[PDB]
Amino acid sequence: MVKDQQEAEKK
Amino acid sequence: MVKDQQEAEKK
Amino acid sequence: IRDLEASIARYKEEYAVLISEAQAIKADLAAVEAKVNRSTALLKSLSA
Amino acid sequence: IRDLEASIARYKEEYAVLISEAQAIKADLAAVEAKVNRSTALLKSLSA
Numbered sequence A, B: 001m002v003k004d005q006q007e008a009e010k011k
Numbered sequence C, D: 001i002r003d004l005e006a007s008i009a010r011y012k013e014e015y016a017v018l019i020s021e022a023q024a025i026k027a028d029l030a031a032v033e034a035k036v037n038r039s040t041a042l043l044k045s046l047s048a
Helices: A002-011 B002-010 C004-047 D002-047
Strands: none
Touching: A002 B002, A002 C004, B002 D002, C004 D002
16 A cells, blocks of 8 residues: 555656 | 555655 | 654554444344344244 | 556455454454453362
């Protein structure tokens, strides 16, 4: 979930 | 919780 | 950011508690529904 | 984004099921701990 949230924030 | 995790990832 | 992480963790355990009482009431609902079905079949036979 | 959201929602569902069986395990462990303390006192007296 942390990785997915970071990816969503980046993109 | 998903919204707050996304906010933490953005900031 | 530390405060945000702390709030995330705290609300994580309160969410765990909420789902725990959710499973408790799920078990209660299942028992009540099984009892109601049993009593309804009994009521059908005794009406007959 | 759509695939990520769908995978996240599937993770929410399976994680809720995992939480459900997790506090099922936790309630079982609490009940076992209480009954084992009671049975340990009972069996120590019964052996003495």
